Design a protein around this ligand. Structure first.
Ligand SMILES: NC(=O)c1ccc(NC(=O)[C@@H]2CCCO2)cc1
Lengths: 178, 245
């Protein structure tokens, strides 16, 4: 297998840690959801090619501008996350996360990922957002931002129900192979 | 890691580690608090273990089996002895706090009610100064270490064979040289996430909520100081490139 490296970036409440935990764990965390993610080396077979994909989180590094870039060396694919229940996490993508990743990871494919897609049809989420003149991120709003920032592609998933999780990591492997 | 500690931290959580008859005797809030304290100790155990792989497996194996130029092994594993000393002592205190709290007749049933004070001690005074100086040095030498590793792996056959041999076992899957370096750099930024979640479930005793709030503040000051003290070293960087920063 060829070795590839993946790093997930995004705001503190974007759901990046939960996404890495659910993908890596063999059994879903029904008793305890871990606070942090150390690292993992996933065995993935995509389109007939065997890859060892090493997974890394940037959670905890959001406020430390000189510590955070040390996670970037030799990255082959970036998952850039936002939460669908947080339109404010989408607005930070183009002028905060995108220029940083393009500077430290030139030519590295970025997949923009909309997490917590299950909250798009959650009444509590819709009521809370409606108090700040907001609504859950629309599918076209995600695609348009991905198009604008020069992302390799746009995908959506739910770490809670597991829907879309496998497809995100299999597509990340294909991007890393290009 | 030693077998005694691995078995004590083998379960996915505190609620799965203790006996179910002991678990049933506690309130949900106590269980939530204990599950996060257990994760902090379990990840500290794994972090000290990463430092042992770096010093004993990699560093020592290179000195005893390879003929590398002087000061090359130091460049690959900067501050590893100092880091191991800081974290082994911290782990010792965390493990003794759990051990003191075990019920008589049990090696697995315990509740830690007073973690805040231990965290204030670790993240204040001389021990905090040592952590700040050591991580400022380590994180400033991080890129240099990865480049030196990549150079040696590409040009030295015996170095390539040594790495492939010692990293072949399945238990080393996540612990290659470059993975260990990033695991260590990322460790310090895990602390505020763990402490904030422990604090979220430690409101029952006001003295404990206060101590954890103080510990959280101390960790953040330490991280801010480390972040401000970083400047990446580069092999062959000229003085002109440095003073024109
Ligand atoms: N193509 C592969 O080698 C492959 C790797 C991993 C998976 N599993 C998952 O992605 C799911 C996601 C939640 C639990 O496991 C499936 C296939």
């Amino acid at each position: 297998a060829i070795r590839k490296k993946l790093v997930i970036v995004g705001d503190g409440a974007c759901g990046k840690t939960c996404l890495l935990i659910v993908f890596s764990k063999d059994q879903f965390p029904e008793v305890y959801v871990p606070t942090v993610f150390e690292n993992y080396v996933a065995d993935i077979e995509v389109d007939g090619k065997q890859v060892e994909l090493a997974l890394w989180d940037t959670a905890g590094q959001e406020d430390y501008d000189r510590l955070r870039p040390l996670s970037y060396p030799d990255t082959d694919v970036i998952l850039m996350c936002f939460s669908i229940d947080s339109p404010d996490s989408l607005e930070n993508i183009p002028e905060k996360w995108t220029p940083e990743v393009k500077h430290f990871c030139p030519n590295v494919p970025i997949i923009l990922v909309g997490n917590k897609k299950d909250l798009r049809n959650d009444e509590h989420t819709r009521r809370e957002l409606a108090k700040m003149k907001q609504e859950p991120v629309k599918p076209e709003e995600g695609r348009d931002m991905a198009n604008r920032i020069g992302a390799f592609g746009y995908m959506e998933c739910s770490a809670k129900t597991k829907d879309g999780v496998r497809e995100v990591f299999e597509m990340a492997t294909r991007a890393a192979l290009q | 890691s030693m077998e005694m500690d691995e078995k004590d931290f083998a379960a996915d959580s505190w609620s799965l580690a203790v006996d179910s008859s002991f678990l049933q005797q506690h309130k949900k809030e106590v269980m939530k608090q204990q599950d996060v304290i257990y994760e902090l100790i379990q990840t500290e155990l794994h972090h000290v273990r990463t430092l042992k792989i770096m010093t004993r497996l990699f560093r020592t194996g290179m000195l005893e089996e390879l003929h590398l130029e002087p000061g090359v092994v130091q460049g690959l594993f900067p501050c590893v002895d100092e880091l191991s000393d800081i974290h082994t002592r911290f782990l010792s205190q965390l493990l003794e706090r759990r051990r003191q709290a075990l019920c008589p007749g049990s090696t697995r049933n315990f509740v830690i009610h007073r973690l805040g004070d231990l965290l204030i001690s670790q993240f204040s005074g001389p021990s905090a100064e040592q952590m700040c100086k050591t991580y400022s040095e380590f994180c400033s030498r991080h890129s240099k270490a990865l480049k030196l590793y990549k150079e040696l792996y590409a040009r030295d056959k015996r170095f390539q064979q040594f790495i492939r041999k010692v990293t072949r076992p399945a238990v080393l899957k996540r612990h290659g040289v470059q993975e260990c370096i990033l695991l260590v750099t990322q460790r310090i930024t895990k602390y505020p996430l763990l402490i904030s979640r422990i604090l979220q479930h430690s409101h029952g005793i006001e003295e404990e909520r206060q101590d954890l709030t103080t510990a959280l503040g101390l960790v953040k000051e330490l991280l801010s100081n480390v972040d401000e003290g970083i400047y990446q070293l580069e092999k062959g960087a000229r003085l002109q490139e440095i003073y024109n920063r």
